[PDB]
Amino acid sequence: GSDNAEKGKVSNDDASVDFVAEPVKLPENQTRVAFFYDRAVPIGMLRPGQNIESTFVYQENDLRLNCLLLTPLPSFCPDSTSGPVKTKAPVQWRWVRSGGTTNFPLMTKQDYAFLCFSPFTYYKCDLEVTVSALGTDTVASVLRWAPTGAPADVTDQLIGYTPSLGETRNPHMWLVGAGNTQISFVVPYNSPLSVLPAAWFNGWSDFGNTKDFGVAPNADFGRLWIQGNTSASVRIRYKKMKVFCPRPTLFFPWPV
Amino acid sequence: SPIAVTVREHKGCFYSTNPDTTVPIYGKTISTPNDYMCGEFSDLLELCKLPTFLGNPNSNNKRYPYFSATNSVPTTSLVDYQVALSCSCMCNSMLAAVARNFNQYRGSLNFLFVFTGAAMVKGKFLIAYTPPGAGKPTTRDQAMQATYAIWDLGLNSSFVFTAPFISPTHYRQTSYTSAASVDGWVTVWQLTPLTYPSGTPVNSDILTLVSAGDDFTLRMPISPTKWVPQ
Amino acid sequence: SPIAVTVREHKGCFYSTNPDTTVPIYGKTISTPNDYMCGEFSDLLELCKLPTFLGNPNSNNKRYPYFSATNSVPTTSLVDYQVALSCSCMCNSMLAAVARNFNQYRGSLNFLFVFTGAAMVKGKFLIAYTPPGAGKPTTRDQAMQATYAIWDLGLNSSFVFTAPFISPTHYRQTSYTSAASVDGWVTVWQLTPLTYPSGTPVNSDILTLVSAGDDFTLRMPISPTKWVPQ
């Protein structure tokens, strides 16, 4: 009943307060930050620019890359007054963008679900990654991972007829043979930062304050490089998620 | 010796929601300490109880965080919210924003009204909740027969109105997916006219917010029909 | 009876860093005894604390294990190291050599200076550490406003200067992978001129070494961009 919104808050009632009624509440857990975000969701896909026997090289094709950034937020070959520089590794973008004329598909990669619904300012967690084959041919593929901020080491094949990506002390994966088609695994919160920005970082990324405003540095879970004969759908999963400082969700269009 | 195993028909299968973990490839990694942080929360449900704004449509059909009243008793209702998470005037409230990610709900909805007209203004309103079965009310008189409360203006600026959870089923679907369309209506009427003195703005604005009440819960996490902001 | 099993989607997959062991094919093999050995160590981190040489560039641009000073007070700084593992004058120190195999660091860097000029020579230096935010110092006067220490020549030949770990984040990236380029600078200035008597070499050389300080740590083992020695 009667109250005062001015003070920053109000009585949070149930039927029994103003009327001859009562609390109808039942136990229920499924609405918890952790449990809720703890399910798999696609953010993009990987397409090999080259064989399992050669030297790897950044490669784009119809918005598809042979390498991808592990973050919920939007990403893509770095943008430029003259167009996204496709000869390079993807980076975090500040907005979502149509692949072409019509809205879909998207040029950018990201967790659309998480974007349309991230009721919070900061978050953190571990990331469980799943890489599933889109094709039906006996697979021969190599996958390389690296933590946020690490050298891409996108150098030349040392050993002929073998995959350059496999040539590293970093965590790499080798998948090959009939029936062997999906890669699954989990990586640690590997960022230099204490917590990550769910949406926006109200500051410059460089000391000169001239560049990339709104994007926090190393605000991601590292990245993936692929090589071999198979393209794959890539999904992420929020492990032991934690969120802070509540904020507004993505706007929804009012009915005409 | 090796253990003999029976390999189940469902092998090699991947489950988006599999209740189990997978292989760790970068172990013993410390998670950058964040003990300094404040503002943390665990349950999406709480966000639901924070009252946020209802979008009220204008003739030229554009939205306001409120509605207006004056020195008259409009024969019809001032505003009318349809108790239904899917419902549109809520399209943009935290309550609805969270609710669209879940299949079912239970419990009370709380409608919050805040009078922003001048201190010198007075008057009374009749807020009501009408359950289905006899159709939506078309007159204060009818509304008055269902669940209602009188709101009196005065020193205290606001009013919390609770739409009771009255239903056949223990739960209710959160979305207009096919058509039983609703779970009744919340209607606001003038009981007595807004009254005041000369020198006072004749048209007062009443802020309209909505939120999940105390009893309230959501369940079964799902995906909404995908959308694109305007 | 056989145990029924659910075969996970990720089968047949190989993990370079898999936290587990594999099949043994030549068991019960004794490992040639080496109990006589000395010089053993367990932590790469220790190698990090052993001071090694900084490579100081010459006009014709070639490197020296040191820098020179004389009977003057150069208006500008004598040498300036950029607190940044990736940084080049350290390119060849054990500290950097180890650090490039790890993604992040934390703690103090220790800069070691050794005076090799003649016993008869004297003088004082001003070593300083400047954190970012206001740009790198361009004058002793400015440097003097940040973290600093005065180094006095005398009987004792050397000096250990600590670049404090002052930072927004609990950790810092070890590599210049994209561009925030640095974590401040270490600058060396003359406070007073090197002074001495007739019959003494007017230009004294100061050995410059660097190492990880006590507080210091590294983490997340990785691979550096591959290289080829000249």
Binding site: L26, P27 | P19, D20, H170 | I3, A4
Partner: peptide, 25 residues
Amino acid sequence: SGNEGVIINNFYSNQYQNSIDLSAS
């Protein structure tokens, strides 16, 4: 009661393996 005859029959926790029974009143 039903058509299930396996001893090691747990692996997945009960509450995950089955809908949770709860009485309104």
